[PDB]
Amino acid sequence: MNYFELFGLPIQFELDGSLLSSQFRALQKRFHPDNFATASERDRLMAVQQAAQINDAYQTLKDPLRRAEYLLSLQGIEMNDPMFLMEQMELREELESVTACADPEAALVAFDTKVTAMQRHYLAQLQGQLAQSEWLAAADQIRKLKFIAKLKNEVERVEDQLL
Amino acid sequence: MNYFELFGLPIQFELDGSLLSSQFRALQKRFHPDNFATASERDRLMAVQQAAQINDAYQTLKDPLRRAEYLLSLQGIEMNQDPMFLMEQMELREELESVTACADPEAALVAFDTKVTAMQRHYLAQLQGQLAQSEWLAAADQIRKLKFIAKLKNEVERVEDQLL
Amino acid sequence: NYFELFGLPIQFELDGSLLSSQFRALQKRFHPDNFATASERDRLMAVQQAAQINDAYQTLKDPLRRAEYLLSLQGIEMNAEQQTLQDPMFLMEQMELREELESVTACADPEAALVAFDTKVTAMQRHYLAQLQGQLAQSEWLAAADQIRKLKFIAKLKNEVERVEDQLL
Amino acid sequence: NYFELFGLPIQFELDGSLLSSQFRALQKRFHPDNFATASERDRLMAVQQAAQINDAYQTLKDPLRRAEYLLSLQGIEMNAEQQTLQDPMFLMEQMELREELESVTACADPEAALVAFDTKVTAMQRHYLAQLQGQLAQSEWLAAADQIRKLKFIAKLKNEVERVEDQLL
Ligand SMILES: [Ca+2]
Ligand SMILES: [Ca+2]
Ligand SMILES: [Ca+2]
Ligand SMILES: [Ca+2]
Ligand SMILES: [Ca+2]
Numbered sequence: 001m002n003y004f005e006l007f008g009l010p011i012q013f014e015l016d017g018s019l020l021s022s023q024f025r026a027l028q029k030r031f032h033p034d035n036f037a038t039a040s041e042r043d044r045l046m047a048v049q050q051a052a053q054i055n056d057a058y059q060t061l062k063d064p065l066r067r068a069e070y071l072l073s074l075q076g077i078e079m080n081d082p083m084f085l086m087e088q089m090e091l092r093e094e095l096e097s098v099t100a101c102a103d104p105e106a107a108l109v110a111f112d113t114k115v116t117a118m119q120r121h122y123l124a125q126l127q128g129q130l131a132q133s134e135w136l137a138a139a140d141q142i143r144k145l146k147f148i149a150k151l152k153n154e155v156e157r158v159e160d161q162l163l
Numbered sequence: 164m165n166y167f168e169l170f171g172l173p174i175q176f177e178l179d180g181s182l183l184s185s186q187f188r189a190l191q192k193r194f195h196p197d198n199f200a201t202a203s204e205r206d207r208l209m210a211v212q213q214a215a216q217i218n219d220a221y222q223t224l225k226d227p228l229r230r231a232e233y234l235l236s237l238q239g240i241e242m243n244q245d246p247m248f249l250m251e252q253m254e255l256r257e258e259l260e261s262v263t264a265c266a267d268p269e270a271a272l273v274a275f276d277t278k279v280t281a282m283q284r285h286y287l288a289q290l291q292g293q294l295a296q297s298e299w300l301a302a303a304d305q306i307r308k309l310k311f312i313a314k315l316k317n318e319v320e321r322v323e324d325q326l327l
Numbered sequence: 328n329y330f331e332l333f334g335l336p337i338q339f340e341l342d343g344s345l346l347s348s349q350f351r352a353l354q355k356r357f358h359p360d361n362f363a364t365a366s367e368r369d370r371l372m373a374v375q376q377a378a379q380i381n382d383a384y385q386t387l388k389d390p391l392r393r394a395e396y397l398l399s400l401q402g403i404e405m406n407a408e409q410q411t412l413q414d415p416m417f418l419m420e421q422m423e424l425r426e427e428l429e430s431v432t433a434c435a436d437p438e439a440a441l442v443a444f445d446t447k448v449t450a451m452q453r454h455y456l457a458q459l460q461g462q463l464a465q466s467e468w469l470a471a472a473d474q475i476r477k478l479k480f481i482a483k484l485k486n487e488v489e490r491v492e493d494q495l496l
Numbered sequence: 497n498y499f500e501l502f503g504l505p506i507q508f509e510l511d512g513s514l515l516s517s518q519f520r521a522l523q524k525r526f527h528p529d530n531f532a533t534a535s536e537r538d539r540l541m542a543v544q545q546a547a548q549i550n551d552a553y554q555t556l557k558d559p560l561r562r563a564e565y566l567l568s569l570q571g572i573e574m575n576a577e578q579q580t581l582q583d584p585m586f587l588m589e590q591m592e593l594r595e596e597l598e599s600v601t602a603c604a605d606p607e608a609a610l611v612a613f614d615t616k617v618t619a620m621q622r623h624y625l626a627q628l629q630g631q632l633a634q635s636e637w638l639a640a641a642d643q644i645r646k647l648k649f650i651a652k653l654k655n656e657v658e659r660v661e662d663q664l665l
Contacts, residue, residue, distance in 0.1 A: 018435040033250055045246040052249050082208040085215050086196055102343065109449060116442070156496075159489075160324075160662050181604035266512060273618060280611070320665055324493055327658060359591065371584035378580065378587045408551050415540040418547050422528065 003057035003070060013068060013130045015061060024058045065149065068126055068142050072135055079139050088147050091115070095154055104162050112155050119148045166220035166233060176231060176294045178224065187221040228313065231290055231306050235299055242303050252311050255279070259318055269326055276319050283312045329383040329396060339394055339463045346387060353380045391482070394459060394475050398468055405472050407479065414473065421480055424448075428487055438495055445488055452481045498552040498565060508563060508632045510556065519553045560651070563628055563644055567637055580645055590649055593617075597656060607664060614657055621650045 004011045007023040031051040036044045060066045072079065094111060101107035126141035167174045170186045194214040199207045223229045235242070258275065265271040290305035292298075330337045333349035357380060362373040386392045398405070411418065431440040459474035499506045502518050526549060531542040555561045564574060580587070600609035628643035 016435065033253060048246045048250050048253070049244070051253070052244075082211045086211050089196060089211070089214070156492075157662060161659060179604065264513075320661075321493060323658070325490065327655070359588070371588075374584045374587050374591070375581050377591070378584075382577070382580075412544050412547060415543045415547075418543050419528065422543075422546075 002074065003060050006054065006057045007061070009061070011071070011074065013064075013071060013127050015067065017062070020058070020061055024054070027054045028058075064123060064126070065142055065145055068130060068138060071130055072139060072142075075135055077135055077139065079142070081140075081144075084144060084147075088151065091151060092154070095151070095158060098158060099162055108155065108158060108162060112159075115148065115151055115155060119145065119152065122148060165237065166223050169217065169220045170224070172224070174234070174237065176227070176234060176291050178230065180225065183221070183224060187217070190217045191221075227287060227290070228306055228309055231294060231302060234294060235303060235306075238299055240299050240303065242306075245304075245308075248308060248311075252315065255315060256318070259315070259322065262322055263325070272319065272322060272326060276323075279312065279316055279319060283309065283316065286312060328400075329387055332380065332383050333387065335387070337397070337400070339390070339397060339460055341387065341390075341393065343388075346384070350380070350384050390456065390459075391475060391478055394463060394471060397463060398472060398475070401468055403468055403472070405476075407476065410472070411476055411480075414476070417477060417480075421484075424484060425487070428484070428491060431491055432494070441488070441491055441495060445492075448481065448484055448488060452478065452485070455481060497569070498555055501549060501552050502556065504556070506566070506569070508559070508566065508629050510562065512557070515553070515556060519549075522549050559625060559628075560644060560647055563632060563640060566632060567641055567644075570637055572637055572641065574641065574644070576645065576648070579641075583642070583645070586646060586649075590653075593653060594656065597653070597660060600660065601663070610657070610660060610664065614661075617650065617653055617657060621647065621654070624650065 002011070006027070007020060009015065009020065009023070028051070031047060031054055033044070033048055033051060036047040039047070060070050069079070098104050098107040098111055122141055122145050126138055126145065129135075129138040129141060165174070170183060170190070172178070172183070172186075191214070194210060194217055196207070196211055196214060199210040202210070223233050232242075262268050262271045262275060286305055286309050290302055290309065293301040293305065328337075332353070333346055335341070335346065335349065354377075357373060357376045359370065359373045359377050362370040365373075386396050395405075428444060431437050431444060434440050455474050455478050459471055459478065462468075462471040462474060497506070501522065502515055504510065504515065504518075523546070526542060526546045528539060528542045528546055531539040534542075555565050567574070597613060600606050600613060603609050624643050624647050628640050628647065631637075631640035631643060
C-alpha cells in the first residue's frame with residue numbers, strides 16, 4: 001500500500017492535517033511494539049516494520065514538500081535558475097544584516113513576513129500545478145520551496161540568537 | 164571538478180574543517196555576485212552558478228553524512244531496515260519523551276544527551292573505518308543509522324530549548 | 328550614574344549605536360588585561376570597574392531595564408508582584424491570552440493560528456512601549472511603572488509563544 | 497507564606513512531582529472560571545488568589561528563586577548592584593570563563609570544545625547548588641546568598657553557551 005491508502009486518504013495534495021494526525025495516532029497506538037511484546041520473533045519483527053512504514057508515511061504526508069515530492073514519485077518522476085539563485089543569496093544577505101538594524105526585532109518580523117508570503121505563494125502555485133498534472137512546473141516549485149524552507153530555518157535561528 | 168578538487172582537497176572522509184571553512188571563505192569571496200555586477204549577462208549568470216556550486220560543495224563536504232554519501236556516489240553507489248535498530252530507536256525516542264517527567268529533567272537530559280552523542284561518535288568512527296577500507300556496503304549502513312541518530316540528536320536539542 | 332558613564336543623557340530615548348561606541352570606548356579602556364601584572368588592589372579595581380560598565384550597558388540596552396533604572400533614579404522601587412495583584416483586570420487579560428495560546432495547538436491549520444497570535448502579542452508590545460515612552464517623557468512615573476509591569480508579562484508571553492513555535496516546527 | 501499554600505515544609509529540598517501535581521489541586525479550585533458569573537468583587541478576588549498561587553508555584557519550583565525567598569523570610573534582601581562588585585575574584589573567573597567560551601569557535605575543532613566547556617559549566621552548577629543546599633540547612637544565609645550570586649551568573653553563562661551551540665546547530 002502507498003502512504004495515502006494507509007491512512008484511508010485520497011491521493012492528492014490537499015490534506016486535512018488534523019485528520020492525518022488522528023489517523024496516525026490510531027495506527028501508531030495499534031502497531032506500537034509494546035502490543036507485540038510476547039508475540040513470536042517473526043511477528044514482532046514484522047510489526048516493528050509496519051510501525052516503521054507508518055511513521056515514514058506520516059512524515060511524508062505531513063510535510064507539503066515531501067508530500068508533493070511523493071505525489072511526483074507515484075507518477076514515476078524522480079528529481080535531483082540563476083536569477084532565483086541570486087535573489088536567495090540577496091535575501092540570505094539581508095537576513096544576516098537584521099542583527100545590526102536599528103530595530104532588529106522589527107526588521108526580523110518584516111523579513112519573516114515577506115519570506116512567509118513567498119512560501120505561501122509558491123505553495124499555492126505548487127497546489128494548482130499538481131491539480132492539473134503539470135508535474136515539472138510542480139517539481140520546479142518544490143526545489144524553490146526547499147530553498148525558502150532553509151531560509152525560514154535561518155530566520156528562526158536569528159530569532160533565537162537576537163532575542 | 165568534484166567538490167574535493169574544487170577546494171583542492173584529497174578525496175577521503177578525513178577532513179580539516181577549519182581549512183575547509185577558510186578555503187570556502189576565499190572562494191565565496193572571489194565568486195560573490197558583487198564581483199560581477201557590471202559584467203555581461205552571460206558572465207554574471209555563469210558566475211552565480213559557480214557561486215552556487217561552491218556553496219553546494221561546501222555544504223556537502225562540511226557534513227560527515229553528506230560527505231560520506233558523496234564519497235559513495237563517486238563510486239557509482241546510490242542508496243534508497245534492521246528491525247532491532249528500529250525498535251531501539253523507538254525506545255530511545257520514548258525515553259527522551261519521559262525526560263520532562265523526571266525528578267531532575269535537566270539532569271536526565273544531560274545523561275541522555277551523552278549516551279546519544281557517544282553512540283553517534285561510535286557510528287562515526289565505524290563509518291570512517293570502512294570508508295578507508297572501501298567497505299561501501301557497511302559504510303552505507305552506517306550512514307542510514309547516523310541519519311536516525313542525527314534526527315534523535317535534533318529532538319534532544321528541542322527538549323533542551325524547552326527546559327531552558 | 329549609568330547614563331553619566333556612557334556620556335549619554337538621562338532619558339528613555341537611546342542612541343543605540345552610540346551606546347555600543349561608548350561601551351567599546353570604555354571596554355578598551357578599563358580592560359582588566361591591562362592590569363594583569365599590576366598590584367592586586369589595582370587589578371581588582373579594574374575588574375570591579377569593568378563589571379560595573381557591564382551592568383550599566385545591560386541595564387541601558389534593554390528598554391524595560393532602562394525604564395526601571397530611570398524610575399530607580401527617582402527613588403522609586405516597585406514590588407513587582409503585589410503591584411500586579413493590585414491590577415486584577417489585567418491579570419484576567421493575561422489569562423485569556425494564555426488560554427488562547429493553548430488553543431492554538433487545538434485547531435486545524437494551527438500554524439496560521441500561531442502567526443495570528445504572534446502578530447497580536449507583538450502589536451500589544453509595540454503599543455505598551457509607545458505608552459511607556461510617552462509616559463516617562465511626561466514624567467508620569469506611576470503610569471510608567473504599570474507599563475513596565477505589563478511589558479514584563481508580555482516578555483513572558485512571547486517566551487511561551489516561542490515554546491509553542493518550537494513544538495510546531 | 498508560599499510553602500504553606502502547597503502544604504510543604506519550609507525548606508530548600510522539594511519534590512517536583514509532588515508540587516507540580518499539587519499545583520494542579522489549588523489551580524483547579526481557585527480557577528476564576530468558577531466565578532465567571534459572580535459579583536465583580538468575588539471574581540477579581542478569585543483572580544488575585546489564582547495569580548498568587550501562580551507566583552507561589554513559580555517561586556518554589558525554581559531552586560534559585562526558592563532559596564532567595566527563604567532568605568526573604570529571614571528579612572534578608574539581595575542587591576547585585578553592590579554585592580557582586582564586592583567579590584572581584586569571582587568576577588575575574590566570570591571573565592575568564594566568557595573568554596574561554598568565545599575561544600571555542602576559534603579552535604580547529606569547535607564542536608568538541610563546546611561539549612567540554614558545557615560539561616565544565618554543568619559541573620560548576622551542580623557544585624554550587626550542593627553548597628547552597630548545604631549552607632541553607634545550617635542557616636548560613638550569607639554563604640547561601642553568595643552561592644545564589646554565582647548560580648545566577650552560571651544561569652547567564654549557560655544561556656551564552658546555548659547561543660554558541662545554536663551557532664553550531
Ligand atoms: Ca522561533
Ligand atoms: Ca518565529
Ligand atoms: Ca545541547
Ligand atoms: Ca536553542
Ligand atoms: Ca526556539
